[PDB]
Design a protein around this ligand. Structure first.
Ligand code: ACV
Ligand code: FE
Length: 329
């Protein structure tokens, strides 16, 4: 028997406005969700997610094998030693069904001081040929800033929920330095679906991606309408309902660190489902040198002995560890 998680729908539209009490009522809902199973759906978010899905499908369904090698990250193409994060992540027919394309802050150019300094986790995005993929780069860059805007407002809700002033997180989330990323993931329909691409959980469930916590402050996720996610609870894994009109929001492990686990990073996994679908996360990451002072809203004095953690080190370590534990995607 598999139960179903309570995933509240939260109208986040007040977070874009100037009605402070309405913002507090959104914040209370974020607090309640974050203290329960974590996840909530942000609704009334203002982003055209139908166009996001359409433009993403057009890219996934038209990119050629040649273009995939030309854009491939270093894990697939030794010529591309600078691509640890950004680029194409290839499928392996018979072995690995998922494939994806990751891009970073469009302001990371050769002019940017973090690129000049060669700081880890900063890379210049790679893109397919414009004439072969008309409008794709422009769509993808616009989307980065659209979802940046939503995420900034969500971060105001999380700050208010934790008893802070509304810019407590968002002040560290800036277009000039954010390490945030978009990933356009394709999960294919395959007939036959190769068993080598399916993992078996300890509890017997067939999975496409094993349990993990997110490497993020928060994660702002669109998925097409195919149920697949499960969240761990003390009584076992519970199904998260799909909703292709909203964004599924959760805390990542940086939030758990800074709140002394008051808002935990929910453990979750991806069930195997033989269906063509999309998983389009935006990982809300701060800047490389961003440090948030930890606190514990359970203590009267709010004091935490947890050490302040630099975001860039957290991200570097976290992305490597996730690959080591859950496989190169
Ligand atoms: C759980 C979903 C969000 C999705 N999984 C994922 O996105 C998984 C787990 S959160 N995330 C990752 O692999 C980290 C990608 C980091 C990215 N290359 C970057 O450099 O920033 C899936 O559908 O498999
Ligand atoms: Fe995740």
């Amino acid at each position: 028997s598999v139960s179903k998680a309570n995933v509240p729908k939260i109208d986040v539209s007040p977070l874009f406005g100037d009605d402070q009490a309405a913002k507090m009522r959104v914040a209370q809902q974020i607090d309640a969700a974050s203290r329960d199973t974590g996840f909530f759906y942000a609704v009334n978010h203002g982003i055209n997610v139908q166009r996001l899905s359409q433009k993403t499908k057009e890219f996934h369904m038209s990119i050629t094998p040649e273009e995939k090698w030309d854009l491939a990250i270093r894990a697939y193409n030794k010529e591309h030693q600078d691509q640890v994060r950004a680029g194409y992540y290839l499928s392996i027919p018979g072995k690995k069904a998922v494939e994806s394309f990751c891009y970073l802050n469009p302001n990371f150019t050769p002019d940017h001081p973090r690129i000049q300094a060669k700081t880890p986790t900063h890379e210049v995005n790679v893109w397919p040929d414009e004439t072969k993929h008309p409008g794709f780069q422009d769509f993808a860059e616009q989307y980065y800033w659209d979802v940046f805007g939503l995420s900034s407002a969500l971060l105001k809700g999380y700050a208010l929920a934790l008893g802070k002033e509304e810019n407590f997180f968002a002040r560290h989330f800036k277009p000039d330095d954010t390490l945030a990323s978009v990933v356009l993931i394709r999960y294919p329909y395959l007939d036959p679906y190769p068993e080598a691409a399916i993992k078996t959980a300890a509890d017997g469930t067939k999975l496409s991606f094993e349990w993990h916590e997110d490497v993020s402050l928060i994660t702002v996720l669109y998925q097409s309408n195919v149920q697949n996610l499960q969240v761990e609870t003390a009584a076992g894994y519970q199904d998260i309902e799909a909703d292709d009109t909203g964004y599924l929001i959760e805390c990542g492990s940086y939030m758990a660190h800074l709140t002394n686990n008051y808002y935990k990073a929910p453990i979750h996994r991806v069930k195997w489902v033989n269906a063509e679908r999309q998983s389009l996360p935006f990982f809300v990451n701060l800047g490389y040198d961003s440090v948030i002072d930890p606190f514990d809203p359970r203590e009267p004095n709010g004091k935490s002995d947890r050490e302040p953690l630099s975001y860039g080190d957290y991200l570097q370590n976290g992305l490597v560890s996730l690959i080591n534990k859950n496989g190169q995607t």
